[PDB]
């Protein structure tokens with residue numbers, strides 16, 4: 001089975017690119033990371049930082065998760081991220097996305113030993 005930590009890396013980590021490279025970035029990425037296999041995932045965020053940097057967030061600012069749990073943490077510094085929003089004209093299996101680059105603080109939920117990121121909660 002794919003572990004929770006590995007799933008987070010697959011759905012959210014992209015250190016190979018410093019920013020949202022192109023307008024076609026989300027269409028290629030959502031497809032290659034298997035996020036459109038069962039249906040079109042409406043929104044998803046990719047983080048362009050090292051794995052070490054994102055893992056360190058688990059020891060940063062503790063904040064409440066959107067779901068009410070208390071295992072969420074916000075990064076002290078802004079990070080390069082790319083938001084993918086499914087455009088209305090998107091129709092499974094032809095999923096379509098709008099690529100958007102930004103620099104914001106990320107909020108992730110952490111779990112386990114080692115305490116690592118397992119879910120992307122929000123960007124602020």
Ligand SMILES: Nc1ncnc2c1ncn2[C@@H]1O[C@H](COP(=O)(O)OP(=O)(O)O)[C@@H](O)[C@H]1OP(=O)(O)O
Pocket residue numbers: 004005007008011065066067069070071072109110111118119120121
């Ligand atoms: N407070 C929280 N809020 C939301 N999801 C949480 C959470 N704490 C943990 N999760 C995890 O985050 C995963 C997030 O759902 P998902 O795997 O579809 O990812 P994402 O939310 O990043 O798109 C859940 O399977 C759950 O896995 P773990 O139980 O393996 O951590």
